[PDB]
Symmetry: D2
Subunit: 498 residues, 4 copies
């Protein structure tokens, strides 16, 4: 029997595993060490969670290695691997309300949104990649023939082997799902390290892999610290690939660690300062709706959030007025209240960073139009914030807040290349967007934006089939889409002479 | 007008540039610093070559950046970029005897081989990749529609931008060509750093780009040290990708440096300890010829050389006997002499390693059947070497020689999995091969070998259309084939709502 | 409420719909016309089935047209189309025993084979193609730019529209599934004409599309004659594509009718005279098992059955003795009995073709080693038959039996090119096979065989991911694999200037 | 030595072969029969050309079959086949002025346009497809494994064999090039039948294949009639594929003949009635320029010409005024004169049809704004024509003119779906276009148009990399792009068990 933290909430009885998941079983960490996970709605302790030690990382990797090399996962047909991943998606769907509730509790995700996105997209991710398993194909290649003999050259796509994945805290289940689905679809086994502050949906997911009949050791989950657990994963001689999403400084470190151990493969998604360019010829009311969403979606805790809005001179003031009108209509509160628009920030230290980010924005001369502070109420709520008169040299024009902070600059009527230059003048390159009714501007601007994703007349429109990843210091490699699979496969060339 | 080192040799008048190649012109390094390049046939100085400094790297990168951002290369059609690369191949073909002679002098490449392979394959490489330019395609993807609206999602394959490539000394022109052809075909610009010991064909190639009409700054070439020039390339904030081929330890350092600067993309080809498994049921005479080739081709200075031969017990002794017969027929001599089939080693420091390598081989208990020593003559010739009775724990069973040293172990008749385990018991995974007439054994062995390339009843059969790269500590990423383009492209996702 | 023919058989209750399926309802044909479907195990009438008339074809096409143009199927996400098809596969699985029992009744399919193949593969087919829906992708193409302007060229993959599929009787559910899964996955709607003699699993399948929630009109099924129903489908101005499997002569007529109406697209799978070449160096026992399978699988009513076996001189007599010994072991009888491994032929007229076929073989001088006659029991059982001394000019060397008749010729030891010539001396080119342990012979033979499928050391190894179709007079176009989708899609090129 | 018709024009000495091209040699037809090719600039006879007979077709096919089966073309590397095609493109470029001049004489192509398009694009076509040769790749497919055994499944892309291509007269060299380049790049051999009225660039092209070193029998060219030569190609038992561009009725007949002989593969490009929708929010002057090019380009003898322009009510009159202004400026004249904008129609019979066409347009009640008549000068010149007040029921709203006749209908302001319906009402679906600055309309309209090509804010922008082909009664199959290759290849599936 699995030990649960039990909690009657949201019309449900949540049953929440809290231990490490190694070789298909939930087990205490070395020395039964634990830590507290904190509810951001009221600052309370949800429960104690096992705190993985180095010896636990080694056990997880050994279980993953054994599962890949000798266990069933390495022997079944691609098609049957596919069936298991579909079945996993089904099981996640059967538990979707419970998962969304756990996410509401652990990450402060608004319940209605956690259902549709955090959980709904996770389900879609597994179903999408499940369909790839038997459609991953190599090549036959018309090489020059060693006359009078003949040659056949083919490629085989093969799994990389044991993978480590390090997840951030903003969408705990969904980031896990993005990377894990592609990893498992390609035939690998995995050790997953969730963000220390958000372990609960990952551990509930682990239990769901058991219900789905995923062979023991294919998935291992180790709550605990990046600098202990994540570090050992990057150093481990039996791990052949790291998939990472998080900050630029940690991504750099992780890549360095992959280098110094055994040149394991690495993919990096490192956040952004993504620009949204709104032209005077756009649909204005839509621009306001999508611009708001571009910033405030999931309380700003969103890798692709627009970190700067460039609004054409002649519509700037009307744009700002409408935004203020819309912001005042936002309902802030408990993520379980069904009319909540804006939930709390993920954890305390992030709230403090947002407070300091906004103090700095004011200090350096930007105009604070709304917000900029903690909402007085228990937990870690931050006021939806609007800054105008933001200039290109300012800190808040360069640094990613990862909070609900709209950062607006004007640009000159009928200038296009000039605004592009300012939009591209970051070392980040994750996402971007443009609002305009003009086909020629939209196409030209999408060509010129230096960003892995460009939205046109929409924002936050990700899709499990559409590859997502950064340029420049936003990193490299894709999650989602066919392209994600290539991070998790190797190519063997086989050349016959006959 | 360009300065040349002129040399009458091989019935040609060689005209060899010796300066840095920057922004379309040959220029002295900072402070007019130079170094000597050594002819390995006799130890003489061929000539003095500019020695690039930090400020020269910055200049090369600035030229590459300008050529990409504002120059013609970034504006022309993919089709026309292709035409220029074809033309470049034609120019190399027109200079094929001269390039082969420079490679003979600089790297000790046997002229007839240099013409067919070092140079001939280089020409094939530029022609092959020229064909890809207008055939690099993104996708349109059927994402979920935001009803009542519609969505269009497409991807664009874009160049990565400024690339640095760092080349080894074993096939100077060919390794340059492999990486440069893919890089340029993808629309990038490049700073190339040849091995310090082998700058000459690179510099001649630089001249050839001028003849072909490649726009100034697209190709920049910097003879000099890896610890100075290579390091700066890996550190440079405007370089977006490093392509590297060389030792595992330098590979690790480069990847580390890519991480710590601007998370530039990196590909690594890092050498190997590649097993060749020879079963009793093979064509024995062919196994001898191809076994010979697998070790001795290009005086063993060959990324994919078989570093271990495993020979089935019942044919082992007869295989060794026949190898000794063939080794005795090898004509050692000046690479310019027509009947030479074993040239000198590339440079002195490499000769020293080979001597030490075989001393250690004898020390640890292997049977030295022939060779092991520097040939008594001027230059840096090394006697074709055969070791038998090699055991798995031995240094020479583990470490890559990169020299003409056949390293032979027995395996028991009828064993298949046991020899596979032994063949896979390395941290390398670059290449491998199997000789057998049994279809079932050949297919099974090719599945089980943990290597990026598996040869079946042949060896050294590379092709410009067939991707080449390693697993495990042999690195990641491919040169050659369609797959190579992916290291030099990025994918932008563009999502419309309408 | 649907009308059923109900029958207690095989430990279950069959509930068989027997009417036309049009616009999501079961309906009588015009004038309530019917015909009898015959159980080949005892010659009895299973039930009466509606006999579609021209006005029923027009009704079915109109419903398909309306479902495509205005109904939900043409509006839902590709992903959701995929979900519906994966649900259809699930419902088929929930009815697997029932479907397999109907197939045993209607087509004489041995129940254990029908479960695993007729039905099992049909389920795989729908799951396979379900996974393609949101992975069908067009391209973005790097065209020459109309300077000083820019161009973007993309392709969209779109459905062709209303399709007609005409199905043979040998694998009623499976042929229906192969073609229908690919058709529906591509977003099309369809009118299916099962072979008149085998309508029952098609009509049960039709009911299953209702349980799966496939929108009305997407699937329409018309039991009836080819010369009436098939013809009108080929002629109809609103049908855009015909998918056909059947005889060469009907294929020709269908293609002609496609031409003369509205140049509707057409695919053709037209049977064959498939050669299996068995070399002396093969595993002989395995060659007997697979050789027997190549002929006798599904009582020889098998598109890809080996129609000639060429056996190397030195093993010929021993191959024949072993075949004779295994044939004696076959249990002929009721397809519903667990012991049976050879069921009756599909229908009476085909039984009489086989009797005549074997008479002609004897008359023209072939040696009848065993079989040749109807088995003396109720129904339409034919004896497993072996002919030897078959010469290239013989009728039975050229004509497709489509029955359990092994047709053996010798070839001289060491012949390879000579046997290949004889094996290719047909206007057919559907399948082929070779048994040999020799890698070089296997690869060479597979290159040289002029057939859409080459089996090596196996036979009948189809798979839902591996495309299947003929060369020459065996037709063109593929079923199964990614390639099948291409028959059911059109490519729209979109070129912007901006 | 080849017989020529020598002619001094355009400051060149033309050397024009005029005989059948069979098996690498120019030969007279059976009975030395000939016919006259007519210069459309003055009605004169250019020269006599051999008139191929049935026995000549058989000789050509026999030569093509021998070249494919036993000749060098079937034996060389894919890479070297490519080299020959790239050399063929070079030879064409060396002869470009001559080829453009022959085309000017034979087809009335304006010389400056023939250089850039008829000839320029032909050269691009051969170069583009030359690059595909060693990049045509099959697959390796992860099929279900016959446990405890293993399976490997791969596909080989193979040539179809002997092909016949049948070309129209509007772009004699370019149409020949589109189809022949893809056909030969795929490894096939070919028998080409140019339109009887335009044999001369085809015959000169034949001579160029000799200068390029294309092996004998690979290309065979048969000037003569469709009903004799084209018919025998469709019926021939050794021909495995027909590529056809022309009228719908001949297309139907061709497909019927493919069916009744040997179910040879067929592709069909059958012309169109392509709509161009011009919205009020477009760039009006650009719409006029592109609108005119959409009709008048190559004197309207253009497969993808806009056959109807729908112009939004509020800009209709101004659009017509501006078109009239621009039409008055077009310079009609000898195609060899540098100032000529508008050359003669291709041949007399076509001129007569255009005259009759416009008589009928006036009769049925459309407003003739200009032209409609043969130009009063020698040869077969037709005045650029503009019709307004065209109604959907009119003959000229339905029938393809294939001449320089702009056919304008109005549509109500704001009426998107209504105009789409009218634009789609036709049984053709070759091309279409839309001019609008509005991104949402542009994307919506392109989804809704039922045509193989949709131009957005441009027209006639074809590219050798962008596939081109029709929907509905405009046929199926693509010329150009990667997709064109699939018409000329077959897929062989090879499945091993081991
Ligand atoms: N299988 C392949 S492809 C291969 C190829 C070469 C060598 N090896 C292995 O390595 C051994 C020889 O070692 P080696 O010294 O000749 O090869 P490496 O040192 O790995 O040299 C490869 C390239 O990297 C450069 N480099 C060195 N330090 C660098 C740094 N900090 N940053 C950037 N670039 C740097 C080198 O420059 P310098 O010119 O200053 O050295 C050279 O151009 C061989 O015996 C063999 O075992 C393998």
């Amino acid at each position: 029997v699995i030990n649960y933290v039990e909690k009657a909430v949201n019309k449900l009885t949540l049953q929440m595993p809290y231990q490490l998941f190694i070789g298909g079983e939930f087990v205490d960490a070395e020395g039964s060490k634990t830590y507290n996970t904190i509810n951001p709605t009221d600052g309370s302790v949800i429960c104690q969670v096992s705190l993985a030690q180095v010896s636990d990382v080694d056990k997880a990797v050994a279980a993953a290695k054994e599962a890949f090399e000798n266990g069933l996962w390495g022997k079944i047909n691609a098609r049957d691997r596919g069936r298991l991943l579909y079945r996993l998606a089904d099981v996640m769907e059967q538990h979707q309300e419970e998962l969304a509730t756990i996410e509401a509790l652990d990450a402060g995700a608004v319940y209605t949104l956690a259902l549709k996105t955090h959980v709904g997209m996770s389900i879609q991710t597994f179903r999408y990649f499940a369909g790839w398993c038997d459609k991953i194909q190599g090549a036959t290649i018309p090489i020059n023939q060693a006359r009078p003999n003949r040659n056949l050259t083919l490629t085989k796509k093969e799994p990389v082997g044991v993978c480590g994945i390090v997840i951030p805290w903003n969408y705990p289940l969904m980031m896990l799902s993005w990377k894990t689905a592609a990893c498992l679809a390609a035939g690998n086994t995995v050790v997953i390290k969730p963000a220390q502050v958000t372990p609960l949906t990952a551990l509930k997911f682990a239990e769901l892999t058991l219900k789905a009949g995923i062979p023991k050791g294919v998935v291992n989950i180790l709550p605990g610290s990046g600098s202990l657990v994540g570090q050992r994963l990057s150093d481990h001689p039996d791990v052949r690939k790291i998939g990472f999403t998080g900050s630029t400084e940690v991504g750099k470190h992780i890549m360095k660690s992959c280098a110094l151990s055994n040149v394991k493969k690495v993919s990096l998604e490192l956040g952004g300062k993504s620009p949204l360019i709104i032209f005077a010829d756009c649909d204005l009311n839509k621009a306001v709706q999508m611009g708001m969403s571009s910033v405030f979606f999931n309380k700003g805790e969103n890798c692709i959030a627009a970190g700067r809005l460039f609004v054409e001179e002649s519509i700037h003031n009307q744009f700002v007025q409408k935004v203020v009108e819309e912001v005042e209509k936002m309902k802030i509160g408990n993520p379980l209240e069904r009319d909540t628009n804006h939930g709390p920030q993920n954890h305390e230290a992030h709230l403090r960073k947002l407070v300091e980010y906004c103090q700095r924005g004011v200090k350096e001369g930007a105009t604070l139009v709304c917000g900029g502070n903690q909402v007085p109420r228990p937990g870690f709520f931050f006021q939806p914030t609007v800054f105008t008169d933001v200039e290109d040299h300012m800190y808040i024009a360069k640094e990613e807040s990862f909070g609900p902070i709209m950062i607006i600059s004007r640009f000159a009527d009928g200038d296009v290349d000039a605004v592009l230059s300012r939009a591209n003048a970051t070392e980040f390159g994750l996402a971007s967007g443009v609002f305009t009714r003009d086909i020629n501007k939209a196409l030209y601007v999408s060509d010129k934006l230096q960003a892995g994703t460009v939205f046109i007349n929409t924002y936050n429109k990700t899709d499990v089939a559409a590859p997502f990843g950064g340029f420049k210091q936003s990193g490299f490699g894709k999650d989602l889409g066919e392209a994600a699979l290539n991070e998790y496969l190797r190519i063997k060339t086989v050349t016959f002479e006959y």
